[PDB]
Amino acid sequence: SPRTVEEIFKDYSARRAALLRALTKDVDDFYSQCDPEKENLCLYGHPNESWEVNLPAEEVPPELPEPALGINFARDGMQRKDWLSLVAVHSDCWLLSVSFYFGARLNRNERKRLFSLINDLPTLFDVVTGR
Amino acid sequence: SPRTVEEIFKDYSARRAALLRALTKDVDDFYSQCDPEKENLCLYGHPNESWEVNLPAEEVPPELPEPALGINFARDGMQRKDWLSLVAVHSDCWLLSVSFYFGARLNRNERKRLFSLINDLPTLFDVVTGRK
Amino acid sequence: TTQRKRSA
């Protein structure tokens, strides 16, 4: 698992790149995969820069923090941009949660450095909302 | 909902105070409530500085990021110190997730300032493990 | 609706 500040930022940037693609370039496919007729679904971003829509983890309690559950249940009752913005903020929160899970053993000054690197990239919400 | 850096950090500090109480002063109550035979339970801290062990939100997607699910399931399969550390780390991650959910509309500088405030408080993982 | 009961 990622342990150093640099390892954790590499993992963060790869997952973020995956999620950003789902929300923008690949949005037609991503939107389609979030089928309200299915069981509760989540958007995952992986360190190989793939994104995936799937059911939540069966291993409970899971190792890594889990993304927001049931985003497909919100898709049809919202304007598309508002739904993407909802997915974006929960995904930004998940990325932070994952990084500081891996970073639990970093000290105060290391966690500050890690956040400074994370904070150098626009958030998914930043991009989706046009900020 | 909290929107300014000050409002969000007040909310963070209040939830954290609740979880810190759960994991230290009230740890025997918290531990007893996390019975492995129950359905999946989560540890919540609220801005009124109360903590609770409860089922997750019934309606999804939830309004706020949700804590780690089913922390009770592993309680009797690991040494107490290791289980509390697991709960503490997931709780630190949840507190961060909640604050930066509320903080979605903060700009880059504001988000850095908010993390700086958060980072001046020891993490629950630090507290429970007695980190140097 | 924009929420439903979590899946069993």
> Cα separation of A83 and A94, whole Å?
16
- Given a contact cutoff of 8 angstroms between Cβ atoms, the answer to whether A65 and B68 are in contact is yes
Instruction: Pick the residue from chain B with its C-alpha nearest to C4.
Output: B59
Instruction: Check residue A102 and give left, alpha or beta (phi > 0: left; psi -120 to 50: alpha).
Output: alpha
Give B53's DSSP letter: E
Contact state of A60 with B66 under an 8 Å Cβ cutoff: no
> Cα separation of B79 and B58, whole Å?
31
H/E stretch holding B98: helix B80-102
- Given a contact cutoff of 8 angstroms between Cβ atoms, the answer to whether B1 and B102 are in contact is yes
Strand partners, B45: B51
Q: C4 CA to chain A: closest CA distance, Å? A: 6
**Paired tokens of A120:** 């150098």
Q: Which residues from C are below 8 Å from B55, CB to CB?
A: none
The pairs formed by B28-32 with CB atoms below 8 angstroms and a separation of 24 or more are B31/B75, B31/B80, B31/B84
Q: Which residue has the tokens 């890594």?
A: A64
> Closest by alpha carbon to A7, among A85, A81, A114, A115?
A114
Q: Residue B59: what are its φ and ψ, rounded to 5°? A: -100, 135
Q: Which residue has the tokens 């899946």?
A: C7
Cα torsion B44, B46, B52, B58: sign: negative
**What technique determined this structure?**
X-ray
> Closest by alpha carbon to C4, among B72, A41, B7?
A41
> Cα separation of A44 and A53, whole Å?
6
Total CB pairs under 8 A between chain A and C: 18
Q: Residue B72: what are its φ and ψ, rounded to 5°? A: -65, -25
> Cα separation of C1 and C7, whole Å?
16
